[PDB]
Write a protein that binds this ligand. Structure first.
Ligand SMILES: [Zn+2]
Lengths: 211, 72, 44, 36, 60, 72, 101, 22, 102, 213, 60, 224
RNA sequence: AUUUAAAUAAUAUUUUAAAAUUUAUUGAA
RNA sequence: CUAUAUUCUUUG
């Protein structure tokens, strides 16, 4: 009698989806809740696990934070391009970077002004070290499927340079080992691997050939 | 009747005890408790009445954390 | 792969619809609600 | 060199006579309560 | 009694010097002495054992 | 057979030969059914190793009238 | 599943690049809490996994095009050695894994 | 075959059929 | 057709409730929704990815949607995503710290 | 089928034969059963041994761009054998490595690669840390911390238990008295209605006067 | 013990089999001059833990 | 026999795979063999030399090979250099007092066959390390003077140089950060640290249930 | 691990008898 | 005998 009950539950589901009774967060009861904020909408969206497996992007271990701030309105003609690159980068790589790095905290903000210059703030595990603030510099010969990877490369090399600039790493190392888990708010839909935790964690296991 | 006197100091040490007819009588609403030798501690401790068939170390058998006056 | 159990089949279905309709899994489709700013910044 | 005179392990013992299935088992023997 | 050649050996027995074993009149009616009266003495309950075993004593 | 709560996949079983009676026949390449066998001699092991496939068609293949492609 | 280690040579079906995929040790479901329905089908699928992933839809991710898809084609190593040994060394760089000169 | 005969003690040779052919 | 019986009737009546909800006003809306958001995808997103992924405006549509799988109530894979964190297995019957048996 | 019904239908026996069976078996169940012959354990699978300038020529017919690591060891089901040096002999696993052994003995340099052992991220060494006794010691430790907690204030408690026992004994002991005296005076009255004049001595309460009741 | 004595009747010079097989009684079956070419089961085999299989070993 | 209870589900003296049951080699037998003229005092005495000199019969040999027992011997006059398995403490001190040598070799079965029949193998071939319980008790034991003691005190007892405390046992650390990298694993570790009370080692998960198998068990108590 | 022997080979085990059983054919109603 | 009792103690 499983099939018809199944049907029942599906029609029921679509009904509540038309009438706005449906809670999309129920599998997520045990997780802490991300920032409800004008840029952080990349957090509340349920991420497929597959495209998180697709974008595997690691930065230097000595990075504790990545902030992406962008203006809501862009007065400038080229302002829109910069905002779009910033928006796309904030939506594509922010959550994955957080997911794989797990000590890095990532936050994007939509700040409301007409300003054409979005910026990215990188913090290292040193409290005494100033954060590095990278500008978004779209070249007017580069479209929005290319420039975003350029910004990604810039962020990676920025984090790397920020991490190799660190006063003695002993401290940074123990602070890293003891820094709590930053990727807890991420909501992942495990699709076709949900059955036991070990393939929930399946992105951690890496095959090393020819040692 | 057959009951188990199990250590109040929770070592899970139980001793089979047969109730006297007074204690067999339902006259009172209490569990029997008696000072006996606990070999697991090698000391004298209170034993409490508890059911013989059941886990003698249950989770609910944990004492809450008590800070001791002694030391700093 | 011929599923011999129903949950095996919903696994099969899920990887299938991850393959054939992949436009579902691009980030713009995840973001249908934001092609613009947040929904509370609008008009009536 | 001074190596201590006796090992002291808080570990419990694994066997007693009044317990039916207890005792240390061969690695490929069937375990306790197998095939329930 | 478990000697040291047993399969299981137990821990130290209770030291005899503490918490002795009282010589109690046997409560079994066939083993009870005849003249022993059932001890009804109407008394205010003295809850500490220190005084309550003084009542069982005549030292004056 | 692992008692650990989390078991990420390993190249070779990390704890040595897998314990338990079932893992014996698993490592032998036999089915889990073998824990229920009393006769463990050569012939029974050969019988349940499954290399020989014992099953038949209802009619001889020349005379087979239905498409049984593999169903014996 | 799975008791033993095994190496496979798979072809990415979109871009036709050959990468290798390994299957390692995962333990049997507990014999003490016993389930016949788990153990037995696990056995049959184990035999299946051992033979060329016959009834399994292969799902992995391309390295040369990074996406997760099940287009993969499992190659027995003679078909691999037929595919590999007829190649120019510059297309070994594109189609195959690092080195493998 | 409620009970199996002891066939392991015989070497393999065909006995003559008792209603022997003329 | 028993009505005087309470839960035998009002539950199958609940059933016909549910399944006269669908094929009149529910199903055309679901189908129209599925049509409308692909229609949304192909003139807004797709013109970007045709440029991005390196295809034409046409063959990118055959690539991003290789097949049409529209969802009808007897075909659906899952109602909701499987739980992120699954609760922790205690020992057998509330034993502490551990149990010898299973 | 009679094989299911367990009939011994052997032809030397009754002349019959089992109907669903193959009429030819090139190797019967016993010599299928012996896996030592079939598998390669402890057994040489290549029976000819080549001189140096033979081995060098055999290695010379291998196409460049070939690794040994591309030739997986066949399973137990597959027979272990080597056809010697034939064309495409390097595709044969056992031939490859047997040749490798002759090349190790003869002091011939081995042009090909060597077999790689792929390993995971989570792998452990061979001498591996023990989980069993670490478990037993830590959970035991937990039990004795619990014991340390539970034993706080034990002696006073065990002092009050004895007082509660003595009280519970004493109260019912003294209630029993008032029960039994009203019982026995009721029986005194019920002996006094039947006119039995009971003396003072044969009464157990020997100062009792019945006229006062 | 009588059930253990029935392997050789009229061999009076023998001694009965023990409960658990001793090391001589394990080695006696590989130490004959009929087993000396069998490098299986020599010096005891089946009582040792098995050889680590080739890292690619599989029975299918 | 049914009036008698069962004990220790395998049986009291039970063999299992990997029980170390040694055949005895009495030190008196050895010294008799040396002073008689079977064996070189000049030479490291292996199990091979014992088999070849005929002092021990083929039947006696089984895995694991032998134990050196001092039976009726209160001293060893000359120095002896000997390699055997699992000698008793008194035999070892009796050898060492003379100025002799003992090395407790411990071999997997293949090792036995390769030492007893050296002629069969022309090249030195890769030999297995003996299994885990035997590595704990014999090969890496300074008291028995096993042969892996240097290897333990040089290579084995140190973790990976990068490794954190939790990942210490792993050959290579699976992740970079020592902190548990999964929110589920983290929840589980929290529950573990409140399950067991907060002891130092509680960070690493140890499973609540056991094997009761002989291949993981080590010495309960005894002289160090 | 305080602490003494030894001729290392097995293959066998009365006898005649039910009412019965099982397998495969033939025949009768 | 099988289950419940898993420390020196305990059920049918
Ligand atoms: Zn590809």
């Amino acid at each position: 009698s499983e099939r018809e009950a199944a049907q029942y539950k599906f029609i029921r589901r679509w009904e509540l989806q038309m009438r706005d009774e449906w809670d999309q967060l129920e599998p997520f009861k045990g997780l802490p809740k991300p920032k409800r904020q004008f840029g952080n909408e990349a957090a509340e969206v349920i991420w497929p696990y597959a495209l998180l497996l697709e974008r595997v992007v690691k930065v230097h271990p000595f990075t504790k934070s990545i902030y992406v701030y962008y203006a809501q309105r862009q007065s400038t003609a080229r302002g829109k391009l910069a905002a779009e690159i910033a928006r796309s980068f904030a939506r594509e790589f922010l959550i994955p970077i957080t997911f794989h790095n797990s000590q890095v905290y990532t936050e994007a903000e939509m700040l409301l002004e007409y300003s054409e210059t979005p910026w990215v703030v990188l913090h290292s595990l040193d409290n005494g070290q100033k954060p590095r603030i990278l500008p978004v510099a779209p070249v007017e010969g580069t479209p929005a499927h290319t420039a975003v990877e350029q910004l990604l490369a810039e962020v990676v090399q920025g984090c790397e340079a920020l991490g190799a600039s660190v006063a003695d790493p002993v401290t940074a190392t123990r602070v890293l080992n003891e820094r709590p888990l930053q990727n807890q708010y991420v909501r992942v839909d495990y699709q076709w691997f949900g059955d036991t935790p070990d393939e929930r964690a399946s992105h951690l296991v890496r095959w090393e050939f020819e040692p | 009747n057959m009951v188990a006197l199990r250590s109040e100091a929770n070592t899970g040490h139980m001793e089979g005890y047969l109730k006297t007819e007074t204690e067999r009588l339902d006259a009172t609403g209490r569990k029997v408790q008696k000072v006996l030798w606990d070999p697991v501690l090698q000391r004298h401790c209170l034993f409490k009445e508890t059911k013989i068939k059941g886990p003698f170390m249950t989770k609910s058998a944990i004492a809450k954390k008590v800070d001791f006056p002694i030391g700093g | 792969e011929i599923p011999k159990t129903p949950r095996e089949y919903e696994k099969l279905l899920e990887r299938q619809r991850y393959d054939e309709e992949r436009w579902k899994y691009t980030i713009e489709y995840l973001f249908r609600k934001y092609e613009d700013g947040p929904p509370e910044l609008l008009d009536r | 060199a001074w190596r201590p005179y006796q090992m002291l392990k808080p570990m419990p013992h694994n066997w007693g006579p009044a317990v039916r299935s207890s005792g240390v088992r061969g690695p490929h023997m069937q375990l306790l309560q197998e095939r329930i | 009694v478990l000697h040291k050649w047993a399969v299981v050996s137990r821990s130290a027995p209770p030291p005899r010097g503490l918490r002795p074993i009282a010589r109690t009149i046997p409560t079994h009616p066939r083993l009870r002495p005849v003249d022993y009266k059932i001890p009804y003495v109407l008394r205010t309950f003295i809850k500490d054992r220190h005084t309550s075993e003084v009542q069982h004593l005549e030292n004056r | 057979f692992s008692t650990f709560a989390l078991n990420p996949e390993t190249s070779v079983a990390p704890h040595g030969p897998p314990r338990g009676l079932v893992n014996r026949y698993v490592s032998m390449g036999l089915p889990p059914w073998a824990a229920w066998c009393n006769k463990v001699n050569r012939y029974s092991l050969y019988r349940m190793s499954g290399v020989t496939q014992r099953s038949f068609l209802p009619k001889p293949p020349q005379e087979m009238d239905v498409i049984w492609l593999n169903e014996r | 599943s799975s008791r033993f280690f095994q190496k496979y040579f798979i072809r990415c079906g979109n871009c036709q690049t050959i990468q290798r995929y390994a299957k390692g040790y995962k333990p049997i479901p507990n014999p003490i809490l016993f389930d016949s329905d788990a153990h037995c089908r696990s056995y049959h699928r184990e035999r299946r996994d051992c033979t060329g992933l016959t009834g399994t839809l292969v799902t992995c991710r391309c390295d040369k095009c990074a996406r997760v898809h099940s287009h993969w084609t499992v190659m027995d190593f003679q078909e691999f050695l037929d595919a590999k040994l007829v190649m120019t060394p510059e297309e070994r760089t594109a189609l195959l894994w690092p080195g493998a000169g | 075959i409620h009970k199996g005969w002891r066939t392991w003690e015989y070497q393999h040779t065909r006995p003559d059929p008792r209603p022997f052919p003329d | 057709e028993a009505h005087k019986e309470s839960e035998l009737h009002q539950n199958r009546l609940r059933w016909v409730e549910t399944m006269k909800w669908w094929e009149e006003i529910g199903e055309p809306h679901h189908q129209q929704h599925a049509a409308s958001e692909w229609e949304w995808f192909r003139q807004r997103v797709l013109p970007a990815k045709a440029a991005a992924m390196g295809l034409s405006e046409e063959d990118a549509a055959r690539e991003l949607r290789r097949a049409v799988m529209h969802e009808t109530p007897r075909w659906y894979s899952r109602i909701q995503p499987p739980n992120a964190r699954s609760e922790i297995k205690e020992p057998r019957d509330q034993r502490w710290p551990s149990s010898p048996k299973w | 089928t009679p094989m299911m019904l367990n009939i011994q239908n052997m032809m030397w026996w009754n002349g019959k034969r089992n109907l669903y069976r193959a009429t030819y078996r090139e190797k019967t169940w016993y010599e299928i059963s012996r896996t030592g012959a079939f598998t390669k354990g402890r057994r040489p699978v290549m029976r000819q041994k080549y001189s140096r300038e033979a081995l060098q020529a055999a290695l010379a017919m291998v196409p460049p761009g070939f690794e040994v690591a591309d030739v997986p060891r066949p399973p137990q089901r597959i027979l272990a054998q080597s056809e010697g040096i034939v064309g495409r002999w390097y595709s044969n696993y056992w031939t490859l490595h047997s040749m490798r052994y002759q090349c190790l003995l003869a002091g011939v340099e081995w042009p090909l690669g060597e077999r790689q052992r792929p390993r995971t991220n989570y792998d452990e060494p061979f001498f591996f840390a023990d989980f069993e006794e670490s478990k037993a010691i830590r959970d035991y430790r937990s039990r004795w911390i619990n014991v340390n907690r539970s034993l706080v204030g034990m002696t006073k408690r065990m002092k009050e238990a004895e007082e509660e026992a003595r009280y519970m004994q004493f109260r019912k002991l003294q209630d029993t008295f008032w029960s039994n005296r009203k019982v026995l005076v009721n029986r005194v009255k019920s002996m006094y209605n039947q006119g039995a004049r009971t003396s003072a001595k044969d009464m157990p309460i020997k100062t009792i006067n019945i006229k006062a009741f | 013990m009588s059930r253990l004595r029935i392997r050789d009747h009229s061999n009076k010079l023998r001694q009965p089999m023990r409960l658990r097989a001793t090391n001589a009684d394990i080695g006696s079956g590989s130490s004959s001059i009929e087993w000396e070419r069998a490098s299986n089961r020599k010096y005891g085999a089946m009582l040792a833990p098995p050889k680590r299989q080739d890292f690619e070993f599989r029975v299918v | 026999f049914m009036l008698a209870p069962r004990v220790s589900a395998g049986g009291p003296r039970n063999r299992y795979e990997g029980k170390l049951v040694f055949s005895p080699l009495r030190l008196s037998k050895l010294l008799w063999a040396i002073d008689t003229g079977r064996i070189n005092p000049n030479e490291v005495i292996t199990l091979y030399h014992l088999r070849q000199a005929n002092v021990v019969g083929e039947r006696e040999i089984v895995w694991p090979g032998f134990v050196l027992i001092s039976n009726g011997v209160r001293r060893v006059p000359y120095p002896i250099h000997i390699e055997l398995q699992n000698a008793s403490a008194e035999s070892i001190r009796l050898i060492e007092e003379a100025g002799g040598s003992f090395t407790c070799v411990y071999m997997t079965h293949e090792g036995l066959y390769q030492e007893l029949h050296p002629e069969e193998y022309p090249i030195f071939m890769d030999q297995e390390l003996p299994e885990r319980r035997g590595l704990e008790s014999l090969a890496t034991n300074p008291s028995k003077r096993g042969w892996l003691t240097r290897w333990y005190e040089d290579s084995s007892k140190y973790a990976h140089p990068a490794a954190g405390r939790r990942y210490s046992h792993y050959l290579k650390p699976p992740t970079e950060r020592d902190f548990p990298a999964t929110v589920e694993e983290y929840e589980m570790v929290k529950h573990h640290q409140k399950w067991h009370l907060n002891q130092p080692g509680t960070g690493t998960l140890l499973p609540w249930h056991s094997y009761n198998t002989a291949d993981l068990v080590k010495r309960a108590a005894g002289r160090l």
